Scaffold this active site. Structure first.
Site, mmCIF file in Angstrom:
data_model
loop_
_atom_site.group_PDB
_atom_site.id
_atom_site.type_symbol
_atom_site.label_atom_id
_atom_site.label_comp_id
_atom_site.label_asym_id
_atom_site.label_seq_id
_atom_site.Cartn_x
_atom_site.Cartn_y
_atom_site.Cartn_z
ATOM 1 N N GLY A 144 0.894 -1.197 -0.003
ATOM 2 C CA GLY A 144 0.192 -0.142 -0.150
ATOM 3 C C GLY A 144 0.927 1.077 -0.030
ATOM 4 O O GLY A 144 1.943 1.315 0.369
ATOM 5 N N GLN A 200 2.538 10.107 1.613
ATOM 6 C CA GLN A 200 3.818 9.559 1.723
ATOM 7 C C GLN A 200 4.884 9.865 0.639
ATOM 8 O O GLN A 200 5.978 9.958 1.041
ATOM 9 C CB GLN A 200 3.855 8.138 1.750
ATOM 10 C CG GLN A 200 3.186 7.477 3.151
ATOM 11 C CD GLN A 200 3.046 5.832 2.927
ATOM 12 O OE1 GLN A 200 1.946 5.597 2.306
ATOM 13 N NE2 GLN A 200 3.725 5.242 3.560
ATOM 14 N N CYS A 202 5.175 -0.150 7.653
ATOM 15 C CA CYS A 202 4.869 1.130 6.840
ATOM 16 C C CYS A 202 5.979 1.386 6.265
ATOM 17 O O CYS A 202 7.330 1.717 6.791
ATOM 18 C CB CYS A 202 4.214 2.332 7.842
ATOM 19 S SG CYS A 202 3.712 3.776 6.881
ATOM 20 N N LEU A 203 6.024 1.821 5.188
ATOM 21 C CA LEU A 203 7.327 2.429 4.227
ATOM 22 C C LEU A 203 7.713 3.676 4.704
ATOM 23 O O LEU A 203 8.826 3.907 4.788
ATOM 24 C CB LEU A 203 6.741 2.215 2.667
ATOM 25 C CG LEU A 203 6.453 0.889 2.071
ATOM 26 C CD1 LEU A 203 5.590 0.900 0.833
ATOM 27 C CD2 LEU A 203 7.520 -0.062 2.082
ATOM 28 N N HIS A 248 -5.157 1.378 7.029
ATOM 29 C CA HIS A 248 -3.625 2.049 7.368
ATOM 30 C C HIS A 248 -3.630 3.203 6.195
ATOM 31 O O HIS A 248 -3.019 4.067 6.543
ATOM 32 C CB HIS A 248 -2.681 0.854 6.929
ATOM 33 C CG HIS A 248 -1.501 1.263 7.072
ATOM 34 N ND1 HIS A 248 -0.668 0.793 8.164
ATOM 35 C CD2 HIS A 248 -0.654 1.842 6.186
ATOM 36 C CE1 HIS A 248 0.792 1.412 7.788
ATOM 37 N NE2 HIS A 248 0.839 1.985 6.553
ATOM 38 N N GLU A 249 -4.160 2.817 5.035
ATOM 39 C CA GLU A 249 -3.827 3.898 3.982
ATOM 40 C C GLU A 249 -4.511 5.021 4.073
ATOM 41 O O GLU A 249 -4.086 6.326 3.576
ATOM 42 C CB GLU A 249 -3.669 3.115 2.382
ATOM 43 C CG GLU A 249 -2.711 2.310 2.269
ATOM 44 C CD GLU A 249 -1.254 2.535 2.534
ATOM 45 O OE1 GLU A 249 -0.981 3.727 2.361
ATOM 46 O OE2 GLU A 249 -0.325 1.737 2.845
ATOM 47 N N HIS A 281 -3.292 7.713 6.454
ATOM 48 C CA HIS A 281 -2.143 8.343 5.910
ATOM 49 C C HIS A 281 -2.643 9.791 5.253
ATOM 50 O O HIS A 281 -2.117 10.619 5.252
ATOM 51 C CB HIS A 281 -1.441 7.371 4.799
ATOM 52 C CG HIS A 281 -0.352 6.833 5.147
ATOM 53 N ND1 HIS A 281 0.597 7.156 6.167
ATOM 54 C CD2 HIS A 281 -0.044 5.261 4.900
ATOM 55 C CE1 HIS A 281 1.605 6.208 6.294
ATOM 56 N NE2 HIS A 281 1.362 5.137 5.579
HETATM 57 NI NI NI Z 1 2.075 3.379 5.932
#
Ligand code: NI
Length: 165
Positions: free
Chosen positions: A45, A50, A90-91, A132-133, A136
């Site tokens: 994701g 981000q 999470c990236l 989660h996305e 963000h």
């Molecule tokens: Ni994330």
């Protein structure tokens, strides 16, 4: 192109994304770049916030063979039910995972990469990834659900990794 993924502490990760105006060629290029970035970072994701693009655009692919592209433009949660959690990554928070409470099922509406509206009912990993996305895009991170000490710990670890990179 593959884009730079911001990491905490970066305050930009705390921004609230604006809704998308029209789904044009320019939006479609952002979608395509976001997939490229996600796939390259080995992620499932990615939210536009981000990569410092503050518009309501999410890309997801929870498949092993990386051929199930889900695009959520201006997503809207219509209902949720149940509770669950897994140890989420999470990236934007490299190499840190923690269990975080989530709805088990969500039903959302969004626009696809052509600007077409669609509804989606999701459960399991996909429900969690969607939540989660979507977090963000309102500047929220999986860390936010943990104790203040755990947030500091994680944030300390991340800062150490970026010092060495
Ligand atoms: Ni994330």
């Amino acid at each position: 192109s593959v884009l730079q993924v911001l990491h905490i502490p970066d305050e930009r990760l705390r921004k609230v994304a604006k809704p998308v105006e029209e789904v044009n060629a320019e939006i479609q290029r952002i979608v395509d770049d976001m997939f490229e970035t996600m796939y390259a970072e080995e992620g499932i994701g990615l939210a536009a916030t981000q990569v410092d693009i503050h518009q309501r655009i999410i890309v997801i692919d929870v498949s092993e063979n990386r051929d199930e592209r889900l695009v959520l433009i201006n997503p809207e949660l219509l209902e949720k039910s149940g509770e669950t959690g897994i140890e989420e990554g999470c990236l934007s928070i490299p190499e840190q995972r923690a269990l975080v409470p989530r709805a088990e099922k969500v039903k959302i509406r969004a626009l696809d990469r052509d600007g077409k509206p669609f509804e989606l009912e999701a459960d399991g990993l996909l429900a969690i990834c969607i939540q989660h996305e979507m977090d963000h895009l309102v500047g929220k991170l999986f860390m936010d659900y943990l104790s203040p000490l755990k947030q500091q710990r994680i944030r300390q670890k991340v800062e150490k990794l970026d010092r060495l990179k």
